[PDB]
């Protein structure tokens, strides 16, 4: 009766502080073993792993039938031990937000998390595929994950080849990420950045027989988050940056905070696997 | 290092009257303690080419739990085949997803057999796994040939499902034979709803890097022949203002190809059916 997931495995890693992480890995479906994979392969790391692993895995498998298929790559979902939910609110609050002075308690642990990914997760995944070598590495994240991806690019650009910021929470802590962006731009193989967002995030339409008070509240919230304009402001700031090879920005029409995750992660891994290297910006 | 478990889900094997096997994969909201947690009316979506879309549909449904317009979700049913190392059964689906015609080659035209199997075998089997649950409404999703099946289902047996979701329907198949059924559907006589979608890169594909011009012109020629977008628009215009159709929703996904659009269409498909029902009149 139970659904067994093929060509995939999961294991638990602990960070320096002893906090546990669920590492889920998948590889091309046509593979008989892990060992069958040989030579250079791309790899993508997905934060909030529990929420995205299956979609990223299956989307990657679907590419096998596509004409522009190059051989695929390895999916790595970095998540938490959970039951009956996709997110660890407390853990991700620390792991995904950059350090600031006025940040409340339980925030500003992004550098701890990034160090963990580079020093613990990456080597552990590399060990699972001895015959495989990493052609290139991508970091994907959504919302707070998007903020982490941007933070990673601006403070440690050599860490990953491609950064995929899905609907990044630029709003967080009075637009503190824009300070790092300016410093990154003003400083003298450059990585690539993929920024995306849904059109319904900042400009949500009213539902069927939705009461006005409920709608204006969603409108107010949307206006404050300022998902589209903050993203457009960032991209305009990064425009003509020498430290960035390519900047791809996409507004997914008719997608909201939640629904866009399907789109962004699917295109993210597809372009990284099949369209590398991207054209200069 | 252990295998990856899929929680709040199960699979079982059914066989049609011809003795041909099927893998039925089912999932339900993640917050549920088990199957029996579910009570009262719930929506249910049936996805053909189940092996290719079950995990995306499942996880996309779970992701909606955090969304504002969440209303308890629904049940995902992926109707697939016993496969190992691939997502599609080319031979089986060729029969199951295409409607009967006099000119169709051998191995095609088994859509009615498949739709009977879904209604007579799959639906009751799933209902039996959730006795306390009532089926508020039913949706039939399919992609490519699956989209052709969804349209075929609507035109020949519109009462079978409440919603039909045709993702990039292969209207081109067999000299546009489906337009006969659509023509008869509109020119005769609670009305169901139809969701049609396609990728913008299907009919107008962009050139790849390091792609020879000769190779690119071959892809464009193929794309022009299949005529994904224009055939869909021609069909939607033909169905517009029809009495037997409650709502028609068409979408062109910008920058999506044949394969990539599947992620978008199935995700929005189940979301709209679960959260935005009933659709506004069209
Ligand atoms: Cl601060
Ligand atoms: Cl014919």
Swiss-Prot record, chain B:
Record keywords, A-Z: Cytoplasm, Hydrolase
EC class: hydrolase
Name of this chain's protein: Siderophore triacetylfusarinine C esterase
Species: Aspergillus fumigatus (strain ATCC MYA-4609 / CBS 101355 / FGSC A1100 / Af293) (Neosartorya fumigata)
GO molecular function, one term: hydrolase activity, acting on ester bonds
Gene: estB
Stated induction or repression of this protein's expression: Expression is induced during iron deprivation.
Family of the protein in this entry: Belongs to the esterase D family.
Lineage summary: Eukaryota, Fungi, Dikarya, Ascomycota, Pezizomycotina
Listed GO CC annotations: cytoplasm
PANTHER family, per the entry: SIDEROPHORE TRIACETYLFUSARININE C ESTERASE, SIDEROPHORE-DEGRADING ESTERASE (EUROFUNG)
């Amino acid at each position: 009766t139970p659904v067994p997931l093929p060509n995939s495995e999961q294991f638990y890693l602990e960070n320096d502080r002893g906090e546990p992480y669920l590492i889920q890995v998948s590889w091309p479906l046509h593979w008989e073993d892990k060992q069958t994979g040989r030579g250079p392969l791309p790899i993508i790391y997905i934060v909030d792993g529990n929420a995205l692993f299956l979609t990223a895995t299956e989307a990657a498998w679907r590419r096998a039938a596509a004409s522009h298929f190059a051989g695929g790559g390895i999916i790595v979902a970095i998540g938490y031990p959970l039951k009956g939910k996709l997110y660890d609110a407390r853990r991700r609050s620390f792991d995904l937000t950059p350090p600031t002075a006025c940040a409340p308690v339980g925030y500003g642990g992004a550098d701890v998390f990034l160090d963990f990914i580079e020093n613990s997760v990456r080597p552990a995944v590399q060990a699972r595929f001895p015959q495989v070598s990493l052609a290139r590495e991508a970091l994907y994240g959504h919302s707070y994950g998007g903020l982490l991806a941007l933070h990673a690019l601006f403070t440690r650009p050599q860490s990953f080849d491609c950064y995929i910021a899905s609907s990044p929470s630029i709003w967080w802590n009075s637009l503190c990420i824009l300070h790092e962006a300016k410093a990154f731009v003003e400083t003298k193989q450059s990585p690539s950045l993929m920024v995306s967002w849904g059109s319904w995030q900042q400009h949500p339409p009213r539902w069927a027989d939705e009461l006005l008070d409920h709608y204006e509240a969603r409108k107010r919230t949307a206006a404050e988050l300022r998902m589209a304009d903050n993203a457009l402001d960032l991209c305009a700031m990064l425009h003509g940056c020498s430290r960035l090879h390519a900047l791809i920005k996409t507004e997914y029409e008719g997608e909201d905070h939640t629904s866009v995750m399907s789109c962004s992660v699917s295109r993210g891994l597809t372009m990284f696997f099949e369209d590398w290297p991207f054209h200069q910006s």
